[PDB]
Each structure stands twice: as C-alpha cells, then as structure tokens.
C-alpha cells in the first residue's frame, strides 16, 4: 500500500576542471522514472521508465526549467558555503538535496521532508511541521534564517502535502502496469557443505517488486541457532530485487531449518526447507 | 514533478 515520490540532487564542485557537476534522479516507489545531468551541452530532464516515453513536450520543458534552476542555485550554494566554512577553491565539495512525500498503506499522507547535506553531513533539515528547520551549525543557522520566510509562506508545505501527492497519484496511474503489479519472490533454498560437521543453508528470494521483504530463518526444537548472514536487498538490473539469508547448521540437523518470506505479492507468507 | 528552490543558502 505504502507509496512515495522522492527526488535526489547531487552537486559536486570540480576545482579548475570546469563548473560544478549536477545530477537529479526521481523515483516513484522503488522505480527511478526521470534524470537530469547538466553535463549535456543542451541539458534536459529525460525519461528513465517506458511509461514516461509518450509525455507532452510541455511536461519535459517545465521539468528542464525546474532542473537548470536548481543546478544554478546549487552552483551558487557551493560558493556560498565554501565561504561560511572558510575553505579554499582547491577542495572539491559536495551538496546533496532530497525532497519527497510518503503515503501510507491506507493511502493517506504520512510525511514529507526536504533535506540539505554538505560534504556527507546534514546541513538544513526541514522539521515535521514543514515550516521550521533544524540547522546543524553556526554556518547553517545563517542559511536557516534565509529559508524561514519562504517556509513561513508554506512554500515547502504546499509542495509536499499537495503538489507531490497530486503527481505521485498521476505517475502511479501512468505506469500502473508495472508500478502497482505485485511481482512476488521466486524462492529456493541451496545447500553448501562446509565440512562433515556443518553446511550453509542459503534462502533465496529473486525477481520481486516492490523491494520490501522479510527473510527470517527458523529452527524446530530448543537447540542453539547461529546468526543469519542477511545480505542487503539489491537490484537485479531489470527493476526487480534480490535478497538471501544464510545459516551455518550442524550436518543432519538440516531438515529442521525452515525459511519464511513475507512480501505483498505473496497471498500468504511461504516457508521453505532444503529439499535434498 | 520536482521543486526548484525559492531561497538560497
């Protein structure tokens, strides 16, 4: 049920190698659908999903406008801060900017946020109310006091609670074929003997969307149970995800181990056990 | 639909 339209901007300065690098990416849920990169000599917002391919010419124009505006502001914000933190023009620095809205399982507005990070650390962070900020720093505090006027006038508020949600609903309808199709995991357990005393049991989930998933190993009876190595969810490269969970178990005890998988695409959660 | 800043740091 839970849906999000998020957007991720990265400005990176390039001392004496031309002017600063800028990149946008936008995601509906776990599916990137757009991209801007100013390193084109005619920079444009372009589609990165098949369901953005037959859009109006005005849509892309209006988004290319927003984008080149952000690149130019952030080109400045990099010089501005380099100042505040009294750093030379030799040091290459990083601005990252993140804004999105989140709906709940039940479809209602959960939260929005707009977030600034300089050299990998929080800088300006927008609060719950979408009106105040938590600036991390004496330097940030300057940039807080400069951003208060706009967010008093609910600039960020109206974008997040209304605009973002409105367009999130649009994009889901545009690409529902893929965005709202619950493709569940293909799940198999593999057996890898370590010695005569042991073997690794590995529980695979494969080719599932969305990326939310729970692989938990369970063992019948009272005995000990060695930690699971749980590898972090990873893209297949076709918009589906992969995860596995692995247990080192004593030899013979192997049939007592059962692997559980929860995911929306599964009617009821599945159990597997290594089938010899 | 993305948001361009109305302020600067």
């Amino acid at each position: 049920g839970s849906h999000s339209l998020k957007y991720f901007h990265t400005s990176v300065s390039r001392p004496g190698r031309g002017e600063p690098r800028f990149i946008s990416v936008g995601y509906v849920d776990d599916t990137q659908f757009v991209r801007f990169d100013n390193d084109a000599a005619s920079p444009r917002m372009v589609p990165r999903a098949p369901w953005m391919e037959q859009e109006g010419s005005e849509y892309w124009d209006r988004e290319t406008r927003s984008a080149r505006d952000t690149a130019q502001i952030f080109r400045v914000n990099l010089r501005t801060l380099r100042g505040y933190y009294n750093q030379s023009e030799a040091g290459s620095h990083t601005l990252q900017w993140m804004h999105g809205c989140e709906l709940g399982p039940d479809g209602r507005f959960l939260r929005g946020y707009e977030q600034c990070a300089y050299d990998g650390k929080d800088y300006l962070t927008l609060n719950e109310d979408l009106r105040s900020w938590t600036a991390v720093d004496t330097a940030a505090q300057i940039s807080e006091q400069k951003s208060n006027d706009a967010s008093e006038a609910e600039h960020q508020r109206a974008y997040l609670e209304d605009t973002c949600v409105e367009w999130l609903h649009k994009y889901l309808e545009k690409g529902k074929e893929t965005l709202l199709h619950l493709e569940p995991p293909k799940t198999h357990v593999t057996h890898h003997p370590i010695s005569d005393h042991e073997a690794t049991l590995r529980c695979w989930a494969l080719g599932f969307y969305p990326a939310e998933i729970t692989l938990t190993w369970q063992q019948d009876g009272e005995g000990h149970t060695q930690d699971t190595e749980l590898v972090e969810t990873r893209p297949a490269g076709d918009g589906t995800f992969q995860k596995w969970a692995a247990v080192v178990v004593p030899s013979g005890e192997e049939q007592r181990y059962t692997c559980h998988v929860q995911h929306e695409g599964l009617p009821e959660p599945v159990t597997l056990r290594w089938k010899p | 639909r993305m948001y361009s800043p109305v302020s600067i740091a």
Partner: T-cell receptor
Amino acid sequence: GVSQNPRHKITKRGQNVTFRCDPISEHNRLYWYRQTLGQGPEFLTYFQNEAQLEKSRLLSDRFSAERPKGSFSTLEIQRTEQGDSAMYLCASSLGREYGYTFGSGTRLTVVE
Amino acid sequence: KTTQPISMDSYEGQEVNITCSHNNIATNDYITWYQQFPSQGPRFIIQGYKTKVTNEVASLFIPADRKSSTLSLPRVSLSDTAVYYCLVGSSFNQGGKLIFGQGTELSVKP
C-alpha cells in the same frame, strides 16, 4: 545590479530601436516588461540562460528578444507605432522567485 | 485575479492600509506585493500565504477565507509616496513571470 541603456530613446514612427539590459551577474532568469503611464508592467518575454522560454500572446511580431551569451539581453521593436511609447522595464532573478530585481527602465517616445 | 483601490491619500505618520481582492485565489497561490517609487522600476516588499508576516518595509494580514489581503505601512513618510501592486500566483506554474495590477497611487501630504 540591473542596468538598461539607453535610458531614453526617441524615434521617427516607422524606424526600429534596440534597447539593452545587463542583469545581476549570476541571475539566470531575465524578463522584459512594458509600462505605459500610470499603469503596471505587462510581461513581454522571459529567458533561462540563452533559452527564450514563454513569450506573451498579445506581443506583436515586430517585438523580438535575444540573450545570445545568456547574460545581456536586447529587445528590438521594428517599424514602431505611437502605442509603442512606454517605459520598457527589464528584470532578473536567481531561478523563480529569489532576488527578483527590476531596472529603472528605458523610456521610449515615438514621434510622427 | 487581482483588483485593488486605484489611489489613496494619507498624512505623514498616519499609518496606511491598502487591501486587495482575489475571491478566486487558488488553493496554491502566494500574495506577493511590490512598491514602485516614482522614476525607478518596482521592487519586492512582502510575500504571504496565510500567516501574518512583518518586515522593515511593511506588514501583511491575510484573513481566514483568503479572499482579501491587507498591506500595512507604518509612520508613512514622503519617501513612501509610490504605486503599490498586489499579485496572486505561484512561481511554480507561472515561472516567476509576474502579472501586475494597475496598482494603488499612495500620496503622503505633510
């Protein structure tokens, strides 16, 4: 910040004219407005760098705007009429909203 | 769309209050105000959505309904003689392209 030359221009009705505008150095948006006496400015056309984006419907095709280098901008009125007599204002901003500054203008009078 | 008084008098010190009309204000529109001194082109003074905002230059009240909005100047001096415009849009759909009223001629007799 926002300088305009010439600050005054006269022309024989039928002749052309070409004012210029120099925006604040970093401002990537540049806008042209048009003020007749005791009114308020009408939008003519705006730019993002060298890119002329929107451009008012009513605006005659005698009027054309240019921002070749994405810095200075020139407005050109061909085969001028009485009506054209106005204060031609230029504005700059850093993207939408931030730093929205105007010029003092170019005062045009067109004479028979 | 934005209608206001065409002109307004005042005495020096006498606190001024222009008010504006925009029944059909969008859910997502910003009350922004510009001040044009004689001979120079206009400049920004204040912006609001719903909260009362205050500044060096002026204040801005916005009533519950949102239909109206009132610009407020203090200790009004000769200086303050100018045309005052009331704008309602979003930079967001517009672009930052401004739509100006005829404004309100303020005079400050001594």
